[PDB]
Amino acid sequence: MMYVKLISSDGHEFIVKREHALTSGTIKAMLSTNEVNFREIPSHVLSKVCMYFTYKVRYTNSSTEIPEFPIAPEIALELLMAANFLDC
Amino acid sequence: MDVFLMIRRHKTTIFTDAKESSTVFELKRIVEGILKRPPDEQRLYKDDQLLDDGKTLGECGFTSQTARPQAPATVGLAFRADDTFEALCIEPFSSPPELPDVM
Amino acid sequence: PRPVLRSVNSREPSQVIFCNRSPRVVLPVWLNFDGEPQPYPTLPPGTGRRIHSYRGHLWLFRDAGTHDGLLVNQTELFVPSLNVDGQPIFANITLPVYTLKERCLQVVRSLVKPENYRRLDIVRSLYEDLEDHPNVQKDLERLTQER
Amino acid sequence: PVKPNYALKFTLAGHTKAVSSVKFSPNGEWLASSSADKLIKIWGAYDGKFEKTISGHKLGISDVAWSSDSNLLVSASDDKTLKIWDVSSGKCLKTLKGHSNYVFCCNFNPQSNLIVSGSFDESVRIWDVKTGKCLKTLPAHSDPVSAVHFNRDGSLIVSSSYDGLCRIWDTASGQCLKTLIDDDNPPVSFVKFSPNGKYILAATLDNTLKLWDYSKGKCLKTYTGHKNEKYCIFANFSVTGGKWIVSGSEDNLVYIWNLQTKEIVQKLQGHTDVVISTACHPTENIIASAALENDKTIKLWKSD
Helix, strand or coil: CCEEEEECCCCCEEEEEHHHHHCCHHHHHHHCCCEEECCCCCHHHHHHHHHHHHHHHHHCCCCCCCCCCCCCHHHHHHHHHHHHHHCC | CCEEEEEEEECEEEEEEECCCCEHHHHHHHHHHHHCCCHHHEEEEECCEECCCCCECCCCCCCCCCCECCECEEEEEEEEECCEECCCCECCCCCCCCCCCCC | CCCCCCCCCCCCEEEEEEEECCCCCEEEEEECCCCCEEECCCECCCCEEEEEEECCCEEEEEECCCCCECEECCECCECCCCCECCECEEEEEECCCCCHHHHHHHHHHHHCCHHHHHHCCCCHHHHHHHHCCCCCHHHHHHHHHHC | CCCCCCEEEEEECCCCCCEEEEEECCCCCEEEEEECCCEEEEEECCCCCEEEEEECCCCCEEEEEECCCCCEEEEEECCCCEEEEECCCCCEEEEECCCCCCEEEEEECCCCCEEEEEECCCCEEEEECCCCCEEEEECCCCCCEEEEEECCCCCEEEEEECCCEEEEEECCCCCEEEEECCCCCCCEEEEEECCCCCEEEEEECCCEEEEEECCCCEEEEEECCCCCCCCCCCEEEECCCCCEEEECCCCCCEEEEECCCCCEEEEECCCCCCEEEEEECCCCCEEEEEECCCCCCEEEEECC
């Protein structure tokens, strides 16, 4: 099963499955080498964006009751910008 | 059930999932895949409790109510090589700014 | 002709359960015969209700506070059918998987008074992107090209 | 005459909202108007000279009808009640509480000791006029009731309903004697007994009117050419001159047929919205027509 390294600005590496990551076209392109650097995106935000990916892939096309995806006020604006850039 | 995990070590963090009904030996065969270091050489912890290779993930306190996709449970990772034992060290994530005055 | 998103007046009744499997206060919206959205009374989260509607009628469901689009039986539009073995039809109202962008706009919208959107230290594009609040009309075009 | 020459004579714009019903008094001296403006207005039947305003109903009024003697007036309001009024005073004698939703149609019995109501609530009710007490609650139809009319002697009651059914009720028992079934079940938007009393006139929302011999259960006539696909449009027997059938339409016209040939003899032009209610004067060749929100006017017409 294929993984990729998403590296934050503060240099935290995050290993997510290729699929979960391709949830962003922005990232699809950055890859189209198994690693991606984000000058603008700090760990605390790129952690939540990887959580969002796992969440998206799980609860998409599931007959199950789907839960709210939570965002603390403190990180809403940055995650928002990050979302906009990644287009996901 | 299913469980959603962050397996962390220093400035590395692995996003992965498994069944509540999974042994912590199973979770190390996954890590062996990614980091190329076999399970004998791995020591997994829930906060600061070493996890026994035979126990189930649900055994250790990893429920589907605690380890969701949107908020996965953290799993400490330190390595070992013969008689030398790397200490568990998890680098904390960046901080946000102060909430702008408008919020 | 007439609008494509409207209720067919079959005049044959259908018992249905509005089952709220969502964390939001659901608003049940009925599309009348002339294609015009008509509001119904609100379902607190978790709650459920046996209601009277007709075969061929058209429903959709939204956050009542914020008009955020919700799903029903995994799609956006509910059309009651003929009840069998006296079994009511089940309308399961869930959240969709909102894009991270959309879920964030929601959270920012919920956090900030529209007057202050522009006091937010973000791209210009996001201001109008925020200010483009969700609306039934503002979607009805999408579904029309689908059906 | 072979065809009438009805000609506009007066326009009455006292109502602030759509006009639901117009009815000439049985003597032929007054016209009464009902509108969503929650008001009944009286006018002289010849000169259109506004007489007075009746108020009380808490919501839109759907219909009104006159007692045999022209001193009493009942109204069917959305407010879920009916109200019996003295004309001469304009005071509410009785409010009639019993219906679970909007009241649409109302009539007196020939002897004017009873009232019959039709409701959204799918029920037909009968009322003691002296008391205000509801004597019966026929469980008539599966959907709402468009019209209720007493036959010549008060023995029978006919009801129309959106379930697409016409029913004949024994007034005494409250039980249903015959129920007229159609090929389809087009919603029946209006019904009335003939002046003789042997046939009923029924409007269906398929742009059609029909004269049924109820005893025989044979369809004698069909009248077409107008638009009636949505609203419940009153029709009439015109007898003061030739034998005409008179109906409103959703093309803002008043249509007039030769009862016998079924050929259209006149379309009256003037109204800016659907003509919901028409009324024929008891004695003289005179029609009243009323239309909805984009008109809000009554028009009186005269012939030879």
